[PDB]
Design a protein around this nucleic acid. Structure first.
Lengths: 365, 346
DNA sequence: CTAGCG
DNA sequence: ATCCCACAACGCTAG
RNA sequence: GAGGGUGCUUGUACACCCAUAGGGUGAGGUUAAGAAUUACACUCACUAAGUGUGAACAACACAUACAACUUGUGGGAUA
């Protein structure tokens, strides 16, 4: 049977459920320490995953031996004294046990092993570099960390123990969307996967990953929704006698141009701003816009994709054709207008995942 | 107490000084073979130096410092791949790992792998017969028994003078790299140049003046520098002014009877900070202008008047007004006197 | 409830 | 200082 | 007055404050000067912001309309 669930990541804000500020500050320090140790652990993980592969390379080049990285107790040609995952897990555990729960290590290690296998061909070829894990990496955690999940009616928050550190969920005015997802969880009706935790400016965010089942609508395979990038208009979609134009030139280009003008002005005025304190503070105003344009354009793409998907759903379009541009049977380039290709800012990632969750068959033309 | 000699880098284009195109193809394929050998040897040396350094954390494997890796790579690629380049690379890798040892042990940075596009290094021993040829109208040298002619083309940049000083011996060369991007050979040359004692030359004339949309505009020789901008200097002033207006409006609607000082201390602070902002901005503009005058060895600084009458002026406010604004003249002349520059008012 | 291994 | 493309998001058992 | 903070995360408007925040500082390293001190587009860090009860810079309670809500880790491609 095929996979009927798609992993979705919901930002659930959790606050530390302790009375005083000293204990909350201690908890904050503990999680900051977890982040630091996790970033160091990931760097160690990937480095130790490079080194033994290049040991195999050096031995093959020196004496032509087809050494394979595996347990020597089970393999004649193996250079390893245990399983490679367990090897690098042993090194990270020996270097950082007791400062953090070991599930952070043993869910980081799996995520990095599973990726290095797929990048092995490139790494031997030489066309990719070794990841330098950031200091602001959200550390992963498994199902084993969540315990004592319970809806507390006294405090109107979902309460759980993330590794003997109690937490209440600060959903705010989200009585309908994620208060339902968590109660579907405490009752064992929805699955949780390995998640992450974010630490931004004194706030704790729970990047919980779930398994949201496919939605069942009335989709007609014969009906075709021809969405064409007349890339003047953001999205213009054809379906029989139905035409919907999603987005406007002033709505995307002009506001992103205003934010661009603000960013360039901040860069120009940053040279004579408060100096003498490094690259960070001079560029503070510029950095504020480092993550305003991305947020705005991501929201625009989310809105456009959702409106396209809804135009397909309401009109029962079972096949969404991305009609690209191909302008004038492959004629030369025109002057310009606004959105470029079908994969501009992860548009074809968003459309693909939303259509697959919605069940719409997707074809790229 | 840094090194008295500086290191500069220039990326120059180099052709093969051979008559037939087939010879060029063969030397280029050999050159790519050299690059691939350098890639493999570099990665092996880095990974195995990491292994030798951190044996105690490598307990999961089954049962000077240069020499072992150097011998291994030499026997791996002798004859097909020059030994001098190998030794220079091994020294570079070991030096880099020695520099980054602490961060390697703590886990703050993964092991830097090399790539297919990495430029292989080489010392001074590789380059031979570094001569400037007039018949071939370029700089010609024999790198590892192979002729090589550079392609500056219509290059008016500093590359020609640097190469001339290098062949003349005025500039020293360091262990450089040879790159091959898109079928073209680029020589990433690192030059060791002694920092010449910058002495002010009176023959240089440094013309500095004000403008209408450029706070300070300065001319000297063929180099142009613009100091600040209208909005750059105006943003903080307008911000202080707007803050003063809103605070005044709030105070007028605030609770009175507690003292006029308690009502207008914010206003006095705003006035003081606006004045101090203008003073600090003028001081930093003067600092930048003095640094510019120093860098180009201009010892005679003449400040243009450029006031005229009617014309385009007398209507625009002429940002920075005149040399009667917030003591620009006194600070600029004081800084010049401290630096020994000639300040002739015009 | 944690840690260990494939 | 702009902009693609890839992979992850375990699962069981023992003290 | 741009920009923010609180109103679950995001955008738009919306009250309320903060706001010279493109600012105010701290520490580490480097430099110049006889000194005061200056400099670093060098490194890292701190700091402002809703109403009520509440002695409280403790805690709790309350806090708008629309739309969005698959994110994270990494790499390769523009100085």
């Amino acid at each position: 049977m095929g996979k009927s669930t798609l992993k979705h990541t919901r930002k659930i804000q959790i606050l530390i459920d302790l009375p005083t500020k000293d204990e909350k500050k201690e908890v904050m320090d503990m999680m900051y320490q977890w982040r630091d140790r996790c970033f160091r652990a990931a760097n160690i993980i990937v480095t130790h995953l490079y080194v033994q592969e290049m040991i195999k390379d050096f031995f093959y080049l020196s004496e032509g031996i087809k050494y394979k990285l595996a347990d020597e107790k089970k393999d004649e040609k193996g250079i390893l004294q245990r399983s490679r995952m367990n090897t690098t897990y042993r090194v990270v555990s020996d270097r950082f046990k007791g400062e953090m729960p070991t599930n952070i290590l043993s869910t980081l290690n799996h995520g990095l092993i599973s990726s290095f296998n797929k990048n092995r061909v490139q790494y031997w070829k030489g066309e990719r570099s070794l990841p330098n894990f950031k200091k602001d990496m959200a550390f992963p955690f498994g199902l084993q960390g969540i315990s004592r999940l319970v809806y507390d009616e006294e405090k109107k928050a979902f309460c759980f123990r993330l590794y003997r550190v109690p937490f209440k969920t600060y959903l705010g005015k989200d009585f309908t969307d994620k208060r339902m997802l968590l109660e579907r969880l405490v009752k064992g009706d929805v699955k949780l996967c390995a998640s992450n935790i974010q630490l931004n400016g004194g706030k704790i965010f729970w990047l919980a990953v779930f398994e949201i089942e496919k939605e069942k609508h009335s989709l007609k395979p014969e009906v075709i929704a021809e969405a064409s990038l007349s890339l003047e208009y953001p999205i213009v979609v054809k379906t029989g006698k139905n035409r919907l134009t999603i987005g406007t030139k002033e709505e995307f280009l002009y506001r992103r141009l205003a934010i661009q003008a603000a960013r360039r002005r901040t860069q120009v005025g940053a040279t004579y701003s408060r100096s003498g304190k490094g690259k960070k503070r001079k560029l503070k105003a510029v950095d504020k816009y480092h993550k305003t344009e991305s947020n705005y354009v991501a929201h625009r793409i989310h809105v456009y994709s959702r409106k396209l998907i809804d135009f397909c759903i309401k009109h029962q379009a079972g096949t969404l054709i991305l009609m690209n541009q191909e302008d004038k049977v492959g004629i030369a380039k025109e002057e310009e207008f606004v959105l470029r290709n079908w994969s501009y800012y992860e548009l074809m990632t968003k459309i693909k995942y939303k259509a697959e969750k919605a069940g719409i068959e997707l074809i790229i033309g």
